[PDB]
């Protein structure tokens, strides 16, 4: 299998147009695209221990989550230098699927809406982040869920009392931004996401919307797993995770 | 004591003009400020639970850290129409110290340095946000102090070893942003503050900078405390505080 | 009738997407829309005599042509504080249809064609200000029905001498803005508005554009009675003009 | 008297730093400066029938306060082609001192301010633009002087009662836009300058700001007609003026 | 023939749509479009020498590739108040026909396409310029063929050895800056244009580009000067050339 | 001598503050500053080729005149990984000093304003680019030193005869912009630059400014050889250069 080939795979999952503007998908490190594959690496983050741990294991092809950067840059120092040096003189390619891996059918949205069981599940934003519909059932069973398959200490902002067969949004990753708690709270009752901070929470507890955080991590590594097991049903390659 | 008193004194302590670019300092909602003044509130957030509970408990003049709003609005609906409601009816004043609180000498940022009492403490900004100096003692000595006056549990991103004798960057409230890791990476070996999140996490850990998150909210009621009774010695007037 | 009612109906004669680009049209200031409405006060400007004449005159619900506020602010005092604190006190709604109202079908622009009965008339801008077609008659034909209709002293920019069936570009409120001047000037023989202001005369006497400022407030004022006539006609509440 | 020796006088009593930033002003149209000038036309406006005039007099060198043009163009066609044909066939040379010559010693603003003797007089903005201080006497001895220098029918907006001794700030122009007003409402009781229009109009009125619009013209050719007094007593050249 | 009807034939043949945007195109200077013209004069540029030799020519319409203006001014001095005279004191009509005869069907770089007999020729850019195709044969014939028909001496930047049937593309004009180099590296395998600089040269060496700089002037004249005999054969009009 | 030593030795010379805004000097690419430094490359640009001579000849620290990146990248492809990859396989550290090497004294500028020995020179630019002053001889004096120093074959735009003793200004680099003509025009009879282009000649030839294009390259290299014999006289290892 040849590295285009991997990458012909991942985008018919995961289109690239489906990204959001600006988003920084796609080849992120790398040069011949003929090369062949013996080791796939999968990791949420492209960190320098992540990028450490595929030279150790021989990794060929490391896909990751996010990607290496998000703002340009035109110099070549400190972190990232060591980065690339360890990317470069192993010839490993570097490959990210962001928001368009967020987004697509089967992505990490939809593993979210699929483990809570949403009925008539919505995309939440247009573009189209997360997912909305109704859970049915009670707000425990919903936590109990989240314990279970995602997190087992998510914080949760309760500002209100949750009725049976409530509107359940969920978002992967960064979801719990002030504007975003603003507009959800217009569309669902409880809004489960992560990386929650001090205005966000207080703006939570005034418009009335629950927010658990689940985590940033946690909510979108569910979903990176299952997408390790189609890569594994499907690719002739061994396939292993680096950060999780 | 008239309100103009008040801000007078205030702004004697605090001069707006050590605010930053942008900040929404000063008068947030009032007309009359020859009002006089029996009872003083201060709190963190002008939420609306803060502007609840200050018309229930009859104070005639709200102090607040953050600014009631950030970015401008030209239409009233929600939850700005209920705060304003409460603020209008009973007339109550609200007043902001944002970042000038922060900076100003003896504030938010000096508070945190005299903790610990910082050894030669500069600030960590050009503008001039946080602190920074050397802490006297083992890393130990640092988290028992900011176990025992800040935060019981704060989360400590242990990115390195560190020595005795170390650099140490204070900033109450949100300093924990991407770019100010990786901006207090080159100047400290330890950086407290608020509001971890996942992608600063990552990157603290890469440039071996430790970072303990003491959350937004407790790193700055720190400070607010202190100021707290700073009002009271000095003014003959009945105050409370009301998120904190 | 309860408030959304009333807004439902004026929404159907003057749909808010008509409206210009950055336009703040809608829901000014209110928060319950099933209120129900036993007054309802129509207005030119949310001035502060106005919204205090609204409070005297018991108005539940308080219609405007022009927006209270163009520009979002941050702070909320002065002149602003005063209207808000009326509006919020006695619960009052205001409510606003700018360009939305002068662009749609029988609105401020079209009463004001009907009213020279401009032959084969057309919107002047494509967005769709102002109305330009043939007057049927002399300049001092068009001139009287002015002076006996609109405003008994116009100002006259004769840049020159007119002739019979010419065409008559009209645009109720501000349009005598130089840019307007320049647009219109290729397109009309004389130009009927309001807010004229030197380089704007100037500018009409070089391109030999003949303007009639009949001011702002009676080009806006002859159009908003008609609505007001609309409105008595057709819905079953008490309705009065506070500064028409 | 050459051109460019007309051009340094006008400069030593009016220096172009003066002028605010982004204010077209200098030589507008000329290439010789070497030209000699037997006769100077003055002007408010470069308007086409100014121009027109100035070919008609034999004018050599045409002085006008308000520039050519303010928005850059990289098309001839129309008004500026015919004005600038005119002005070419005849090397007549274009100069202009506009907001610099508001804003100098003894001009524009000076001249309005030492007509109503200001008592300690400062400039209204700090770029400097207009003149404020107290008028000492009656607000009708201050409109008996308004009614026989400047303009015999001044729009009057008499928001509130005028104690005697009130602060009058006066600019020469358009300074009756809805920020000016809003500025100056918090600088002076009585505001004295040109070009009101309506939403200026209601915001002095909610302001309690007395406005007085003696019009864009009269309160700068008052001025310019001072200049052109001190150009005749100081250059030996015919001087002429041509819109006033 | 009316200057209007000379410029309906030059539009029909390259409309002015096609232009890209921000493209200066169009009427440069003039008033008069029923204005009969018995001359008409073609340049590459409407430089200063070309107007004087137009001027002494007797030429009523100048026909120019190049616009008079790229960048709007708001003052005429020095050579713009020049050439401006010159063109407005014999009242001769400025007009340019610039990318949308670079990118027109028979336009500039069609000519170019052709000269080379390019097969499957396609448009470089979207917008349209340029055009892209393969060249049959050796790349001594190509160069042969530009040394006989457009430049005796082009720089040739030999980044590889070229096959026979290779990839030529073509851009009249400024073509050979850095951002274009990259993209058409990208494209083909040989590019001929002009205005060859330092950066854009090293770049060329390393992408493997081969460019051949045969001169802005020469590779726009070649087709200027087939656009002249169109205009000769189908005009019943004297033409003559002013800079080819 | 380490890195750090030799970055502290060049700084000292040619300090980074000189630089104009947004110009991407410094350190390029490289990590550990303690490198011991056998043999130093300078090169005027950090080419592809450059870097690839750089790696054959055992090159530890290679000095650019230009910057790597101009404009910012994120993501890692063809050329750039190439260059990369080299650097990092041999952690070959990559300074530039851009535009505070052409300010600085006895810098590129410098070096051209003492060829030809000008007198009184003064900066060009306020920034402070470029070198003016008077040349003390006749024009084929200048010619003949540029010829046998600079270039042999100078393209020269011989816009108008120059007198002896003529004002000179030289600026090492791309100079030839349109608006650098325009600029130098006001201040200099000839003009000594690199990279000339069409539409800069044509202007050149209007304004009356004799332009010399001794090229991008040997404007800059003429500069380079100095600061290479400046380096080999004061640093104790060896120094080759690579594309001079
Ligand atoms: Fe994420
Ligand atoms: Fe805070
Ligand atoms: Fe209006
Ligand atoms: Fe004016
Ligand atoms: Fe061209
Ligand atoms: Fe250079």
Redesign the interface.
Same mark, same amino acid.
């Given at each position: 299998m040849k590295a285009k080939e991997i990458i012909e795979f991942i985008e018919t999952f995961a289109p690239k147009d489906l990204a959001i503007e600006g988003d920084?998908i796609? +080849?992120?490190?790398?040069?011949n695209l003929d090369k062949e594959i013996k080791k796939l690496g999968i990791a949420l983050?492209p960190?320098?221990?992540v990028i450490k741990k595929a030279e150790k294991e021989g990794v060929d092809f490391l896909f990751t989550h996010?990607? +290496?950067?998000?703002?340009?840059?035109?110099?070549?120092?400190?972190?990232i !230098?060591?980065k690339?040096?360890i990317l470069?003189?192993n010839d490993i390619i570097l490959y990210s699927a962001h928001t368009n891996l967020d987004i697509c059918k089967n992505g990490l949205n939809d593993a979210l809406a699929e483990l809570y069981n949403l009925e008539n599940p919505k995309p939440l934003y247009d573009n189209g982040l997360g997912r909305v519909g109704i859970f049915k059932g009670s707000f425990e069973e919903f936590l109990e869920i989240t314990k279970k398959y995602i997190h087992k200490n998510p914080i949760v902002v309760k500002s209100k009392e949750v009725d049976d067969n409530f509107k359940l949004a969920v978002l992967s990753g !960064?979801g719990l931004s002030q504007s975003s708690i603003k507009y959800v709270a217009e569309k669902a009752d409880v809004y489960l996401s992560?990386?929650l901070?001090?205005?966000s929470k207080?703006l939570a507890?005034? +418009?009335g919307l629950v927010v658990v955080d689940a985590?940033? !991590?946690s909510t979108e590594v569910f979903g990176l797993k299952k997408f390790k097991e189609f890569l594994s049903s499907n690719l002739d390659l061994e396939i292993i995770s680096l950060d999780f």
């Open positions: 920084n796609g +080849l992120q490190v790398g040069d983050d960190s320098l221990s996010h990607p +290496l950067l998000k703002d340009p840059i035109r110099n070549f120092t400190g972190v !230098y060591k690339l040096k470069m003189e !960064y992560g990386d901070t001090h205005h207080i507890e005034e +418009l985590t940033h !991590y």
